[PDB]
Design a protein around this ligand. Structure first.
Ligand SMILES: *CC(=N)NCCC[C@H](NC(=O)c1ccccc1C(=O)O)C(N)=O
Ligand SMILES: *CC(=N)NCCC[C@H](NC(=O)c1ccccc1C(=O)O)C(N)=O
Ligand SMILES: [Ca+2]
Ligand SMILES: [Ca+2]
Ligand SMILES: [Ca+2]
Ligand SMILES: [Ca+2]
Ligand SMILES: [Ca+2]
Ligand SMILES: [Ca+2]
Ligand SMILES: [Ca+2]
Ligand SMILES: [Ca+2]
Ligand SMILES: [Ca+2]
Ligand SMILES: [Ca+2]
Lengths: 628, 628
């Protein structure tokens, strides 16, 4: 909006940017009734008229000016006995449009969510396209590679003005000091114009028709102190007066939203599997390699030289992605646990079209619940009307905070919440010794229902299984048959052990709490849930450990499952625990491969899921079309 | 929600909290068809029934139990040729309700805005009821005075259980580690139970009927890293097993929202006026004292001994308020400018039922735009449908950030935005030497329209005024008549000064920018706006100063106005600038008192508004009934 004050004493000169509201104040400086307006064909004047303040006179140009003051407006002040007196207004029309991908196709003043919403997307340039280097591309203020531009968002300044227009006018591009530390802008028309150091920059633009392309990168993900919006503004400045300060004639903006980090649940097709080569574990890696081949996945193994004897590939990282209309890339969330695998995410997971992010204190102040076996996501779900088309992040906690209770670090929690798009749900995992949600739950694909099943570890199911076997006459059947370096236990002695039953009743109560929590927060019914037979035992600090290899802690590669080999009671030639799991999962079209991880992973308090990790296909559903 | 697993082998014992959903799993542990349910009169069982997993059996008690397991449920498993087998369930019903003022009358699981919304209000205990002390009441972990409890929110735990119920159960009250630094909870049943040090506390509660009152205080206002919500939770713990860990049976919560700091516009009735006694300024203080008496306001004067020669009472502080259903108190926002008045807000503005808050760096890194003459609020307005019933905060900025541009510190900006309820609007004030929005705008009450008028300083109006006087033959009339220690200037020489006209055209352009900005963001029309004749001059760095005493910079005490005496051209016995202002404002029923502030305030680049401050009545509209 602009109000031009015309005067019969002196002629007025003004600039009009196309698509803006221009109005005239005719009365204030009028002499002493009545007035009439006559304008050149290029000016459309909407409103033989009385001199009354309330009469709105609005002007709109249709095209940009060829020369300065080429459009005219003439206001004639007259009266009953007064010859007309003329006030002149010389107009110069110009086009000044700051353009971006606001429709989100790859080509209001606010950013709005949803399929009918508007607002451009910005990716955090957190990968490393630069060949042979250490830092992320966004850590410096240069565009080192042409491929790097593919990660950036295009913004174009289009101008149509007279040839001499920028003799007396100047354009300045700017971003608030609040947001300058989170964005960098390069001029292509690459050299930096806006960034952490510079909040504003004078643009060198020639008169006539011109197009100036910019490439923009984000430097920070959404977080506690960053909602995730970045506004870039162009200002047209009148610099006609050599002694007076510059005056702003017109401002226009584009609002960018920084793309969130997004996780992928087990129901998303796998693309790449990760694992470690360690102590005598060659046969474990054979089984995983075969499983990866069956699921047609790329396979990456971290060797002992880089491992520092850290076998827990699940725990150091989580592989997610970031997504814009023009570019989608995987992004590794590096856990602050910083064990032997500390460098793996940095050295050769991060790279060309593979982003990096980390959170929390790096030198200490961490717990086991910061290991990313404690970080998972559900498949897409709808909870009492509200859609979660990218699912819901799940992470483990205590039921309330005490001196002995553990939590995932608040910096990690806050980051996950600030991504917004997978609204995190706190589960109860602190009753476990290790304390990870993957120790009692998993998700698998399914051909019916909601496209999945929630698997939960279940003492109830195992007691039921073992009692059925004893009822059928297999009381002597031995748990841990096949393991020569351990004392076997008969089904009858397992069932008669009152303390083991007490322990498992408490664990059942802990899992049941999570069951109902998941049913409420994911909108699940019992028909979505399958119980996996699993016994537990309480050890140090009354914390739960797996009695036999924790079968729910499995590697899910599409319909191919890598399940820990339980070494259960062999009845009719086969482990009754394997047969039970097969009977539950084979009807869903899942293929169960039981992997021997006993002396390699199990005895060190983890299983197949703990020893591996997976990169999965990003969702086809675009995050910005959600309404969180 | 809770799912109790019944069994014919062993009887089940369980607790049921009234108002919770309890269901039975009858099939999982059923022997081998059909089943029937019979329960005691206290148990209402909703659902001669087949053993099919999908059959929902839900139980609800009507009243709390007198003794442990006093309610019974009997599930009879039978078949075509099978005598019935019984599974027993012993139920204990208890009431556990955590109550607060969720309806906001002073007496879902989320906090919702609006008159049909729910959620309790928490005040930040930032005043000082403790007689003879320095710190705010919330800085320690004790309730020192009985009056202090009036600022706190009441929360009551009501329980109805068997007499021996807490032999095997325990209640724990807790708040997340995330929020514990922002709240403190005292047990009245005063001693602290939750706070910055303690996130949880075991409650000592006797069996039977009991009521436990708590008093809660907030320790922080809403801010960048604090949305303003605090959740307090009660957990019922099963401690029946001396070797097993405690197990959670039931959790319930109350969500508090911390009350925002709220400003009061000039259209709110004044209650107390502030000023300084300094160099020869006794006559200035007489005029203000008389004005305060006319508006029936309390008067507070900071003496020279405390001033340290700092006369700018407007700049060091802003007097707002905080509001809850049970308590409303004024709260002083202390500016970080920390000039001679540094201590005034701390020493005897803060006190009994007078809160304190401050923001920004205290030892340096500040600008003139952090002075609270640059912090104002509009009256209530509705902008294209959206109501702002508490108005909109206004503060001055530049049009874009450059090396020479100034801004209010981001910490102050962020705080104001985080209060949410008066959605701040950035204006353009940096063109002024001092740089304050009060230098070019004010608001006054009005009996018609929206209940107010926006006053804007206007060179246009003054040139028009002076030209009319010259046309009527008063060209010799002297600006600064009555001032013996300054050179007078004739109306004809003022009008013929081309450089003065150039300067004022630029200033007019700066004010016009704000005019349209205010029209858009406050929904104003021209009929809401009155121009006040005012000339300006550019000095150091081409920054604007008032040519004669800045009349818009006035003290607004209801219908009584304290306007700077312009000492304009005397025509027909009276200053033509005074007569013009009177002609504009007297029709609104405003009383104009022109105060001589020339050699006291004006020559030091400020006026009557700058030298004073006002505490005003809080809005009757309750902030929580807004939908921001
Ligand atoms: C399911 C899952 N993510 N598990 C990870 C938990 C296992 C590791 N284990 C160890 O650190 C450990 C335990 C005993 C002996 C050796 C080792 C080891 O050095 O790997 C954990 N607790 O984090
Ligand atoms: C309208 C308003 N809030 N004005 C405050 C601006 C005036 C003060 N003035 C001074 O600091 C000053 C200027 C010249 C000579 C002495 C003094 C003084 O020490 O008070 C400001 N610029 O903050
Ligand atoms: Ca770069
Ligand atoms: Ca890149
Ligand atoms: Ca790490
Ligand atoms: Ca790339
Ligand atoms: Ca994980
Ligand atoms: Ca206290
Ligand atoms: Ca108090
Ligand atoms: Ca201060
Ligand atoms: Ca009080
Ligand atoms: Ca103020």
């Amino acid at each position: 909006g602009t109000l031009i004050r015309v005067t019969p004493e002196q002629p007025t000169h003004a600039v009009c940017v196309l698509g803006t509201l221009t109005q005239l104040d005719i009365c204030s400086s009028a002499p002493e009734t009545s007035f009439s307006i006559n304008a050149s064909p290029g000016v459309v004047v909407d409103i033989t008229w009385p001199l009354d303040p309330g009469v709105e006179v609005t002007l709109t140009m249709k095209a940009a000016s060829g020369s300065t003051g080429d459009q005219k407006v003439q206001i004639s002040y007259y009266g009953p006995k007064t010859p007309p007196v003329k006030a002149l207004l010389y107009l110069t029309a110009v086009e000044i449009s700051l353009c971006a991908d606001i429709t989100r196709t790859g080509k209001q003043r606010t950013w709005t969510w949803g399929p009918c919403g508007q607002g451009a997307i910005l990716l955090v340039n957190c990968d490393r396209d630069n060949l042979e280097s250490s830092a992320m591309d966004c850590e410096d203020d240069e565009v080192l590679d042409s491929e790097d531009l593919q990660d950036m968002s295009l913004m174009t300044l289009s101008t149509k003005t007279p040839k001499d227009f920028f003799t007396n006018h100047t354009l300045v591009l700017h971003v608030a000091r609040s947001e300058m530390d989170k964005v960098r802008v390069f001029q292509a028309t690459c050299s930096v114009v806006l960034g952490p150091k510079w909040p504003s920059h004078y643009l060198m633009v020639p008169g006539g028709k011109h197009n100036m392309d910019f490439y923009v990168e984000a430097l920070a993900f959404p977080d506690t102190d960053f909602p995730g919006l970045i506004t870039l503004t162009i200002s047209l400045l009148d610099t006609s007066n050599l002694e007076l300060p510059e005056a702003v004639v017109f401002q226009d903006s584009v609002v960018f939203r920084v793309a969130p980090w997004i996780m992928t649940p087990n129901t998303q097709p796998p693309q790449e599997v990760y694992a470690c080569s360690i102590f005598e574990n060659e046969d474990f890696l054979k089984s995983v390699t075969t499983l990866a081949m069956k699921a047609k996945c790329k396979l990456t193994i971290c060797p002992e030289e880089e491992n520092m004897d850290d076998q827990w590939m699940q725990d150091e990282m989580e592989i997610g992605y970031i997504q814009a209309p023009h570019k989608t890339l995987p992004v590794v969330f590096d856990s602050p646990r910083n064990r032997g695998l500390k460098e793996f995410p940095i050295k050769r997971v991060m790279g060309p079209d593979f982003g990096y992010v980390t959170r929390g204190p790096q030198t200490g102040g961490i717990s086991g619940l910061d290991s990313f076996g404690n970080l998972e996501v559900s498949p897409p779900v709808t909870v009492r009307g509200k859609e979660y088309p990218l699912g819901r992040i799940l992470f483990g906690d205590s039921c309330y905070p005490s001196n002995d209770s553990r939590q995932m670090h608040q910096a990690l929690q806050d980051f996950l919440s600030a991504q917004q798009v997978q609204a995190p749900v706190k589960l109860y995992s602190d009753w476990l010794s290790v304390g990870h949600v993957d120790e009692f739950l998993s998700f698998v694909p399914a051909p019916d229902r909601k496209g999945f099943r929630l698997l939960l570890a279940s003492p109830r199911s195992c007691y039921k299984l073992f009692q059925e076997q004893q009822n059928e006459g297999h009381g002597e059947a031995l748990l841990f048959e096949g393991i020569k370096k351990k004392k076997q236990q008969k089904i009858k002695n397992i069932l008669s052990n009152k303390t083991l039953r007490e322990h498992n009743s408490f664990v059942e109560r802990c899992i049941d709490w999570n069951r109902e929590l998941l049913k409420r927060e994911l909108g699940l019914a019992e028909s979505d849930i399958i119980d996996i037979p699993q016994l537990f035992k309480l050890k140090e600090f009354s914390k739960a450990e797996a009695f036999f290899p924790n079968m729910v802690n499995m590697l899910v590669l599409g319909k191919h499952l890598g399940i820990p080999k339980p070494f259960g009671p062999v009845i009719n030639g086969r482990c009754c625990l394997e047969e039970k799991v097969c009977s539950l999962l084979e009807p869903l079209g899942l293929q169960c491969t039981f992997i021997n991880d006993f002396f390699t992973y199990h005895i060190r308090h983890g299983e197949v899921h703990c020893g591996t990790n997976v990169r999965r296909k990003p969702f086809s559903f675009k995050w910005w079309n959600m309404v969180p």
